[PDB]
Design an enzyme around this catalytic site. Structure first.
Site, PDB file in Angstrom:
ATOM      1  CG  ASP B 143      15.702   7.415  22.847  1.00  0.00           C
ATOM      2  OD1 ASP B 143      16.016   8.378  23.577  1.00  0.00           O
ATOM      3  OD2 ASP B 143      16.546   6.643  22.346  1.00  0.00           O
ATOM      4  CG  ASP B 154      19.828   9.330  24.361  1.00  0.00           C
ATOM      5  OD1 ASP B 154      18.595   9.262  24.551  1.00  0.00           O
ATOM      6  OD2 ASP B 154      20.391   8.794  23.385  1.00  0.00           O
ATOM      7  CG  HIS B 223      25.331   6.372  22.082  1.00  0.00           C
ATOM      8  ND1 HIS B 223      24.280   5.655  22.612  1.00  0.00           N
ATOM      9  CD2 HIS B 223      24.865   7.628  21.884  1.00  0.00           C
ATOM     10  CE1 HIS B 223      23.226   6.442  22.728  1.00  0.00           C
ATOM     11  NE2 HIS B 223      23.553   7.644  22.293  1.00  0.00           N
ATOM     12  CG  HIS B 231      28.084   7.292  18.251  1.00  0.00           C
ATOM     13  ND1 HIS B 231      29.404   6.992  18.510  1.00  0.00           N
ATOM     14  CD2 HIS B 231      27.449   6.104  18.110  1.00  0.00           C
ATOM     15  CE1 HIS B 231      29.561   5.681  18.523  1.00  0.00           C
ATOM     16  NE2 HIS B 231      28.390   5.119  18.283  1.00  0.00           N
ATOM     17  CD  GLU B 256      21.143   3.935  23.196  1.00  0.00           C
ATOM     18  OE1 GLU B 256      21.964   3.524  22.350  1.00  0.00           O
ATOM     19  OE2 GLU B 256      20.153   4.635  22.897  1.00  0.00           O
ATOM     20  CD  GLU B 351      19.497   6.249  25.554  1.00  0.00           C
ATOM     21  OE1 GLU B 351      18.426   6.286  24.913  1.00  0.00           O
ATOM     22  OE2 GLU B 351      20.594   6.589  25.066  1.00  0.00           O
TER      23      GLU B 351
HETATM   24 CO   LIG Z   1      20.963   6.510  22.367  1.00  0.00          CO
END
Ligand SMILES: [Co+2]
Lengths: 129, 370
Positions: B143, B154, B223, B231, B256, B351
């Site tokens: 990640d 992300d 998120h 976030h 995610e 993700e």
């Molecule tokens: Co994340």
RNA sequence: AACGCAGCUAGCUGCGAGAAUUAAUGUGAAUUGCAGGACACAUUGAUCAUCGACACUU
RNA sequence: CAAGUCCUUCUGAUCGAGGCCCAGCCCGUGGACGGUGUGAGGCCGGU
RNA sequence: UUGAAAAGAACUUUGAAGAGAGAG
């Protein structure tokens, strides 16, 4: 009728020892009957429950024909946990339901060195009679 | 316009000097309007007009996603068992820095590269002196994120070497894709949690002679991303029974999805390495000169973005984790220690960052790999 | 009688700087509020009980 | 270290209510007690 | 001395909350 002078039949006394019992004793009361197929083959009626045994519920709302495996032996609350014996919590998670060992049937035993010795010791006491 | 070298070194903007960057997968919003399809906004009405009003914002996400794609292809190219993840993280970070041509806060790494092994789930990166050699029978969650002028993207995937994990990988990938397609405009987060749980649980895993059932990690969730804010305050769940908040036009989300052959919950296990300054806290007095110095260093160099102790040692700062925990107690920075499941369990994560365009839904992080 | 001893522990309880226990024997897969730690269970071991070895601050 | 969780039925759950070739379900030198989602000789510890 | 079992009331809504109204 009980004739042993050193064994009590008092209600409060018997309850006290059952509720206040060491875990190694509690394992002995943590006993469940084997099914007819184990009983005929092992010549044993009841066995203490263990962590991984195939267990079938025969009483209660969860009574049925399906076979499950124990996942936890909670000796403090005198209950055990099977996979599919679950109910739906309010928020959304899933929790196990404690079932007393006396209300289940062992369909397969955790065949183990100490275990293997335990059945034949009980079984060889049967041919004594 | 030039081309990229075999070991990726050319900055993404050099590959697209025109200024327009490759678009993500454009997808029409789900037909959740009681059967009626949403294929009525793709026409170039005022919806498209106000979409054009934010075109420059999207291009940053596009270049960041392209950089992420090249970086992860490069990582996939040479990743192999037997080498520790300290050099793995160094290679990933330096390649991403060269591809994004970081300069202060206008461009750079969004958060430290997480590489969680086995039961560990997220927010783990090796520290100084961490001697952990990779194994053939390992699973890793890579990640990492990049940003352009704060437009964070992300994305995360899972790497395996033993072919006994492909069932779990495909289960988690299907869950993530189902969450992707289920997401949309004016839809409740509980609905996406419903969909993810109903797709992911219908899979069975056979590992080492033991049959497990794959379950979501109810503790983690997706998120929403904000301007320099990873976030944004909205969490899309991956389990049933969540909030009834809607997703609105003009927002971006990180969908995610975690799957474990364990208990479905995580806790703090090992030393914390990820840290994050609070976007909401204002001015809190400090009494230690070292603490003040570290605070101003981090707010100059990392701003509100997440950082790790490797990034602080990379800056030449030492004897600092003291003042770091001091900022933690003062509430300026929140530690994010690794989340791990029961020992012997395995966790997989996939993700993607999605865009809620007025006319369509673009998954900018989509690539040919996954 | 006092004072200390638990990862999170105030009281009760147990214990004594080896401090909610060491060793040994029996037993044989748990303890549990949470987490972690366990756990070939004989190329011999969680828990509990017993208790003869060791230790036992003022 | 003995014998029902047999069948039908009450219940939220039952140890409850009926039946059990042979004059009579099975053990009984064991029908004390306790536990088990009522009330249990035969589910379990025991006796 | 809750309940057989926490299954100890998810979620929506008013209130700053204590408190409610639905729902379970
Ligand atoms: Co994340």
């Amino acid at each position: 009728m009980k004739f042993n002078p050193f064994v009590t039949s008092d209600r409060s006394k018997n309850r006290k020892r059952h509720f206040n019992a060491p875990s190694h004793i509690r394992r002995k009361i943590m006993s469940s009957p084997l099914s007819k197929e184990l009983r005929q083959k092992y010549n044993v009626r009841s066995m203490p429950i263990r962590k991984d045994d195939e267990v079938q519920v025969v009483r209660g709302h969860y009574k049925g024909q399906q076979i499950g495996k124990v996942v936890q032996v909670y000796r403090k609350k005198y209950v055990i946990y099977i996979e599919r014996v679950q109910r739906e919590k309010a928020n959304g998670t899933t929790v196990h339901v404690g079932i007393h060992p006396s209300k289940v049937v062992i369909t397969r035993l955790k065949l183990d060195k100490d275990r293997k010795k335990i059945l034949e010791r009980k079984a060889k006491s049967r041919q004594v009679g | 316009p030039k081309v990229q070298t075999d070991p990726p070194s050319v900055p993404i903007c050099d590959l697209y000097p025109n200024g327009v960057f490759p678009k993500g997968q454009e997808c029409e919003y789900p037909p959740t309007q009681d059967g009626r399809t949403a294929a009525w906004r793709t026409t170039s009405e005022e919806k498209k007009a106000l979409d054009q009003a934010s075109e420059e914002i999207w291009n940053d996400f596009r270049e960041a996603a392209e950089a992420h794609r090249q970086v992860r292809k490069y990582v996939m190219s040479w990743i192999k068992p037997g080498m520790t993840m300290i050099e793995i993280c160094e290679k990933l970070e330096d390649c991403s820095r060269k591809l994004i041509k970081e300069n202060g806060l206008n461009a750079g790494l969004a958060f430290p590269t997480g590489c969680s092994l086995n039961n560990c789930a997220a927010h783990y990166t090796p520290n100084a002196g961490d001697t952990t050699v990779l194994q053939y029978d390992d699973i890793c969650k890579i990640d990492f994120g990049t940003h352009i002028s704060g437009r964070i993207i992300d994305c995360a995937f899972t790497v395996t070497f033993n072919p006994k994990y492909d069932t779990l990988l495909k289960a988690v990938k299907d869950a993530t894709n189902t969450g992707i397609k289920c997401a949309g405009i004016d839809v409740r987060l509980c609905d996406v949690g419903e969909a993810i749980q109903e797709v992911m649980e219908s899979y069975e895993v056979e590992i080492d002679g033991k049959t497990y059932q794959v379950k979501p990690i109810r503790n983690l969730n997706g998120h929403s991303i904000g301007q320099y804010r990873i976030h944004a305050g909205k969490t899309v769940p991956i389990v049933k029974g969540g909030e009834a908040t809607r997703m609105e036009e003009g927002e971006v989300y990180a969908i995610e999805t975690f799957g474990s052959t364990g208990k479905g919950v995580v806790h703090d296990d090992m030393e914390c390495s990820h840290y994050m300054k609070n976007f909401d806290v204002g001015h809190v007095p400090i009494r230690l000169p070292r603490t003040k110095h570290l605070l101003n260093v981090i707010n100059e160099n990392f701003g509100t973005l997440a950082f790790c102790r490797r990034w602080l040692d990379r800056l030449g700062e030492s004897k600092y984790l003291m003042a770091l925990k001091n900022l933690c107690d003062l509430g300026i920075v929140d530690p994010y220690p690794p989340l791990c499941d029961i020992k012997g369990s395995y966790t997989a994560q996939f993700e993607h960052t999605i865009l809620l365009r007025p006319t369509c839904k673009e998954v900018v992080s989509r690539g040919d790999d996954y």
